Amino acid sequence: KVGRLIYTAGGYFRQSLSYLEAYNPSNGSWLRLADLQVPRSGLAGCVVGGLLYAVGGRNNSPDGNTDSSALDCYNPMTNQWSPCASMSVPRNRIGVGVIDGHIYAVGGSHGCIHHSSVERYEPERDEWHLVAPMLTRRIGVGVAVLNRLLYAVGGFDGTNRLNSAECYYPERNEWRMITPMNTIRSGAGVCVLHNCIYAAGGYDGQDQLNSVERYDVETETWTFVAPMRHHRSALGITVHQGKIYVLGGYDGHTFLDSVECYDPDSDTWSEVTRMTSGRSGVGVAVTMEP
């Protein structure tokens, strides 16, 4: 369990960013690591087998917007990125989840297309294959895995921001709606902690949110927990040692550098560090130090 860092990849501030930076909760330090080969915002991060994966996004620059179908793999042992097989389609504002060593890429946008499609990556074969699409088209969708079930939460379908959520049952290759959230949330941070799916922040169609709610998969209810100190949409999120960390985002005024940490035992958020610069739309995951 020792020696793990919180990695933040990519993001946006004025343009899409290539940064890979890693935070050590044990000593408060930050390390700047190998840049992404292509800057990307609106991507997601995940880890399989100790390797960090950066999935999807878009490269916004002064000279273009290119939605990304890319899957790139970072090895902390070498501090190097390698390309992996690309997805079937570009997916900006993506969500991802891992089940049993396989990466699920969910939703996202390609130009004005809002995807319901979902695809699954097999690292052993370096192949993607499509699975059943969601019941709803969702961009800015929060994704998490609990008990080997995949959840897609909130987002934007092209017309409305969403409070709805749905669950994917892999052995049936089927999606089913779950109880909707109490709040419409697009671009929220979604993660799993203990037996609950948390949805932190986001945009409700009117304001960036500091509220946080959690879905208990046994009772099928959403309950609010303590709100974050900062309103934020397009935040990064991960779980480490029993606590939720939220990174950056947009509060309606500033691209935040704040990192807050949620303790479920006390139901409190604390501000624990700042990123080296404010940014939104990052991918975040946890793996060993490089």
Ligand X SMILES: O=C(O)CN(c1cccc(-n2ncc(C(=O)O)c2[C@H]2C[C@@H]2c2ccccc2)c1)S(=O)(=O)c1ccccc1
Rounded to 5 degrees, what are φ and ψ at 235?
-90, 155
Q: Closer to ligand X at the Cβ: 42 or 90?
A: 42
Least spacing, CB of residue 58 vs ligand X, in Å: 6
Q: Which residue is nearest to ligand X (CB)?
A: 187
Question: Of the two residues 110 and 161, which places its CB atom closer to ligand X in the complex?
Answer: 161
For residues 76 and 140, which CB has a smaller minimum distance to ligand X in the complex? 140
Q: What is the C-alpha separation between 251 and 237, in angstroms, rounded?
A: 15
Contact 52, 45 (CB under 8 A): yes
What element of type H or E holds 102?
Answer: strand 102-106
| Choice between 76 and 189, CB closer to ligand X | 189
Residue 186 beta carbon to ligand X: minimum distance, rounded to whole angstroms: 3
Interacting residues toward ligand X by CB under 6 A:
12, 41-42, 58, 92-93, 139-140, 156, 161, 186-187, 203, 233-234, 250, 280-281
**Least distance (Å) between residue 1 CB and ligand X:** 31
The distance of closest approach from Cβ of residue 9 to ligand X in the complex, given in angstroms and rounded to an integer, is 13
Nearest approach in angstroms of CB 101 to ligand X is 26
- Are residues 16 and 64 in contact, defined by beta-carbon separation less than 8 angstroms? no
d(C-alpha 30, C-alpha 197), whole Å: 28
Distance CA 186, CA 205 (A): 8
44 or 52: CB nearest ligand X = 44
- The closest of 159, 165, 98 to 135, measured between CA atoms, is 165
